[PDB]
Amino acid sequence: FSSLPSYAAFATAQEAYEQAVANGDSEVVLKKLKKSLNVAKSEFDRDAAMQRKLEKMADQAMTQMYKQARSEDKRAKVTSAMQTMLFTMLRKLDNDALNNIINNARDGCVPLNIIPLTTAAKLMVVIPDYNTYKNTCDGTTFTYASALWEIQQVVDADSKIVQLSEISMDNSPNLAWPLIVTALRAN
Amino acid sequence: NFNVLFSTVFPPTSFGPLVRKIFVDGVPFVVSTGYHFRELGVVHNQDVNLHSSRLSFKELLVYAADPAMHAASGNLLLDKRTTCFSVAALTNNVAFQTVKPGNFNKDFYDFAVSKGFFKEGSSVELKHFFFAQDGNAAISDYDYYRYNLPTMCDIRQLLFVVEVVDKYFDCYDGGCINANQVIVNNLDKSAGFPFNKWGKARLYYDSMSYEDQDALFAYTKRNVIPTITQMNLKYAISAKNRARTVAGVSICSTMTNRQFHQKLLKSIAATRGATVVIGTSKFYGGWHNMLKTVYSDVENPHLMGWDYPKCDRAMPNMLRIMASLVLARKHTTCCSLSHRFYRLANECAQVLSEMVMCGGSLYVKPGGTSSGDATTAYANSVFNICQAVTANVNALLSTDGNKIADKYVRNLQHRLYECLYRNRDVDTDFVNEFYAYLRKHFSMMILSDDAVVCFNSTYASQGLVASIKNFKSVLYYQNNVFMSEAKCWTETDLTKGPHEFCSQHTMLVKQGDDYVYLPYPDPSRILGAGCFVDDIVKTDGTLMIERFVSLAIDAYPLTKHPNQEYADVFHLYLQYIRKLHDELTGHMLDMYSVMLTNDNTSRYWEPEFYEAMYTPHT
Amino acid sequence: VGACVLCNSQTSLRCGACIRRPFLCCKCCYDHVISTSHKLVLSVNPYVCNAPGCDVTDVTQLYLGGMSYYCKSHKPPISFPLCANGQVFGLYKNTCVGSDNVTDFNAIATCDWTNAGDYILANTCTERLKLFAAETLKATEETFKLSYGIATVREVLSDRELHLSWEVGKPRPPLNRNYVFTGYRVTKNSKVQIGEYTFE
């Protein structure tokens, strides 16, 4: 709004108007200065009032497409993260037992609630209290789910190692007591 | 109904998702291509590709939400804390959660004791507090699902109660909508598991185009997508130490349930003057309109409430199936006949028999309702209506017909038995007759399991509409709970409204020139919400004034109570707001050299503003 | 959110382009900002254009708008010069006294502690500026002593002799007992437990 084509016309019109005003010429000259300046405003009618909306529209479009680009990049990041999570966690499958047992099905369809029941190599047992620990995790090795597991670590709520020599009747009330026993499968 | 019974003989390690080995780019995977429902039997998936080269986006979104891959990549878990059937454990050590206690607001307490409150022997006392929980409470609260037995509902009366309920749900309109017309509010809330590891729901709602969402919706209408669900310990004021729990559903379930239910779900909360009042404002004189709608034409009105114990955890499976089926009955033209069945199967596998992830290890959810999807607040309402109608039917049947005086009710009972245990298909004429009778003598007003009934008295006295004991018996034999008659009010007068509805006592007051009903909350709750707050949320008054404006707005009708202190609560809030404002101006004047010149805020500390909210013009 | 170091009046301005970001009030911050190369000033929020995808950093180039701070290349027509009336916009825009004597601060703050004139300037200031000077001495010593590479010992020979290398392109450090060298060993990911030596 400072270099529009009509700006120079307005400038020369107002220069002539002020020169004639200082001249004090005929009343027709006064009408000329009151009309040429009136149309100097009539050119700016749209000049300083339309590009002002054009710039607003341009800015709106630019910020909208900035947001679009940000969203598009985040999409690629999410896709990469999910793909790498799948292809990283897949290899935990231990493809021997699973492929062996699926072949035993009618057309390779088995319920999901049994895959960790047969093809999992690490059992985790949570016990509320000593009397319940007595029945299941007796001795240093125990059996469950038609197999033979064996104990390798015993922890408690505060996540510290406690050896099995300390789990007695009288020593029980001196432990945090969601015990978490982790075992492995024997052969 | 038959499958519910026949499925109690079979081992519990044969239900759930069905897996099969498929190959992508020469790489083996495990995916779910079906399910084995306890009720609907074996459901085989259709569009599974035995081979594939590469996968673009939606196949990722449906392959990562399955429990199959995580379960197969887990450690076998034997949990002896609960009788719920465990599945596996993802990480190495279980995670223990705790709930912090509340943070005091000493300044407001001192200002309250300054105005002569909390005296020994007073009527209003503190009762609601921020209860703090111990460690292993999440699992000890999830254990409550052991109260949900496998219930086989009666069939030949359910297949008539369904007709009556559907007649109740008649005015509304529903149908599928295109994925570009869905409306979502608060687009920055959490989104299930495992999608929560990379951003909230906004990121997934922007990363996915309209055609992609359309494909994902048109895909579940011919397939099955079992999902997972997280559990959290809430943080809010209460009155009993037992912890609360919410369950956030996965994004792929909500993103389809919205497009499948939105039309009806928005056409229900946009209509005034019906039996379901979800979406009626209690402000601007709405309570009076509702309570005048209730008293339609009943001859000798009494008032009767009820409250189920453990409403969201003892829900039998069959009633939830009926709820979903009735809420998906308007799909006459949009979808075909198999499409509705597959959609119902998807709903039943995503929000009724999910794999809950309470704590840090998966579990199986025997039943009940997960209060996190988009259809709880309406399924519960339709379940409540079904319970009321079946209780009324059982009451009307079990009465010696020799001693019935009228010649209309007796014939109605005769035809009721005829249409119940003799006919095979619905008789619309009799259904309309019975529904007109029910709306004439048993007018109801229903929210999501909280009800108020204006029932005739001279009929209920002689057992033609269920009084309360029919409700007790129906709950006992069809819900496996016992609704003890100590939580069920009964008002023998009508000039004072219902004793308690939505935790708002109702008072009849004289405003303007007539009499209207105004709801007022329990003063202890207001004081408790004023005195206990999470840190920096207030912890002080100066930063956050807008808490007290709303709190005072919700506690204005307390002025009209004939008891004294109940209005002193409102006056105390008013004075505290004024003190807060004129000390904020002083604080940011003295540290400044200038302060406020034009405020107009002097209408906050005087009742002229709060009183406007309870007048009927807007 | 504390009293400034030259006027003891509450303020919320931290000299961003400075070394240790000291507290200055609006008038004294203006004095510090107009006569040096301090073109970055911080507050509860930094002063850059927060219109989406901006690129400006200088304080005088911003203009205040709504709840956002814009720049001349991004500002809507509703503008507000942050630097005006001899006092930059900030909290507590009234309770400030300031002082024309800021050349000491202007030099010492921008002083790189490289010449004897720098230490003489430290010896020629007020007590609070003395504390700031000492803090800047320690800050610049810290930023100096990590201008070399990491002494990577790759192979081992007899005692008092090792095969030691460095990182990419960084110069040679001092060897005397001024610096107590202390490495940390890695298993595959994290650095732990080499100990403290002295190289010669």
Next chain:
Amino acid sequence: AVGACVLCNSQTSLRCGACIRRPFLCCKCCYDHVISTSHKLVLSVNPYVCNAPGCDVTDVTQLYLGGMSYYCKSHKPPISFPLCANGQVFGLYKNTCVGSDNVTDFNAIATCDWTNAGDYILANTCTERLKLFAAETLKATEETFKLSYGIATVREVLSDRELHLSWEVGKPRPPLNRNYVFTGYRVTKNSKVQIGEYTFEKGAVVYRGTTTYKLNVGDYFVLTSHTVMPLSAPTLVPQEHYVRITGLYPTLNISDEFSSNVANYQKVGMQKYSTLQGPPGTGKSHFAIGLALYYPSARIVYTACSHAAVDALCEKALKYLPIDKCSRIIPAVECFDKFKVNSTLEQYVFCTVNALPETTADIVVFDEISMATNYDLSVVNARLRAKHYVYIGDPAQLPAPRTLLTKGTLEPEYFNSVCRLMKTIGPDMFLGTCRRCPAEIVDTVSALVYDNKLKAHKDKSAQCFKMFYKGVITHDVSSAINRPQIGVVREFLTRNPAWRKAVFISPYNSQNAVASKILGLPTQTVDSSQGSEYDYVIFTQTTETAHSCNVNRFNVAITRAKVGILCIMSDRDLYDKLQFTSLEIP
């Protein structure tokens, strides 16, 4: 969707859609490139076309910005905005851009559809980013040109070594030999499955496949191309001669079977990359092996442009050097497996550009650079980062399959980055130590192209003969038939019985196939034959075209045999300089 532009490294969001590679363009340089070409297509987060329903105007200046979309005059609203204004296209970051004075070279690289020798002239006369961009454009246009041929369907199988073969409709038949390796697939009911890799030759279509398969009805064959990803790292890092040999250990014990290589090695310890100007077979299969024991403390990297030409590097590694410290990756092509596969971290790594993972090392050795281009070296230096590099080869050999060369042939030094730095930056090394060929070709090449750097090697036993013949040329499809040479084969083998224990050289192997029906002698191609040859060879020209009558196709072909070969320069290219023995044609 947002990156740095080709010329300015400024961050913008524009793509010229009329280029086959769609590079990111800086605002000012995007305008500069869009004004003066047929590129009227620009892409961004949205494609700049008038997306009005049913409109197809597809220019940039033809559009006006109106509302949230873009429109031409036929659909623009009164409130509009010209996109092409201020001599600058309207895109992201309209204030962070410097432009480039160099836009004519970008125009030339973009506009020239890789049809002449001036193509590679420009492709080497440009900037590093510009030249790698040219390399990827060349790869894309060759993959879109060679896939413009039919699908070789085989409906019946008569026997092995030939097939009853046909193709698609209308699409021409590709040329003959191992630059046209087929790796076609087959259907079962729905999609494509394994067939195997072959190379079809005239019989009846002879297949010289490296693999085997029982072919059947409907088996079709193509020249399968892949997705050529853009190149991130530059082809070569900028060298600087070290003040001291860092990262490399100057060892004291030396095995000196290689006298003229240790002197090179110490100065390699000072400089990043160093290519040795080695004539054909100057013990070039020994340099990295000598370094392997001279400097047995650096991860030395072995590589060559072909999985078959890596023979020299992979042979002596287990003859001289220890066996444990070597590894080679083989994908699933059949190659040497005496090393261990899927062993990334190893002291010695052998591989081809196609199937090597990204790793880090200190020393790299590379062979066969004449047939290499900037793309090939760029892949390697984007894979592995090291402290020093060594290249083995010479510009003066047969280049890559420049099938796009149709007009005048390319010039030697114009091949790629290393060939032109061997002549204008200076030969980093040079050799005369060729204990392989006698005094004939050593002085021949010294005077001829190999800058007179070779000395009289050994006994000129006088077993190579040259004739004065005319011959005639005929053409069938893409090959050449020369009968006055194919009968004169035997009429020329006439005058002692001991020539035929040799190998048959010809540019187009159809002549060799037809002559095999007379003799049965082994057939040799001249394109890919380096390092695999017999003591005595037969070289029949069969042609007079520059495909064989360049300066350097027969240059290495003369040194194929040890001391005795056929040297018939019946072509009038370079016959009339050398002085051999001759007899009249009988």
Next chain:
RNA sequence: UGACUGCUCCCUAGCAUGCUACUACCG
């Protein structure tokens, strides 16, 4: 780690519509 629906207050921004006031142009 932080669910779904439903009403209510407050602050800002844009759009539209309306009303109103002030210089110019036309009959």
Next chain:
RNA sequence: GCGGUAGUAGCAUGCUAGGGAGCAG
């Protein structure tokens, strides 16, 4: 002297977007 048109300003209403907060099941 009126009508109409375009410019800048103040006022009201609604519709929408965005943020913050409080109650209910």
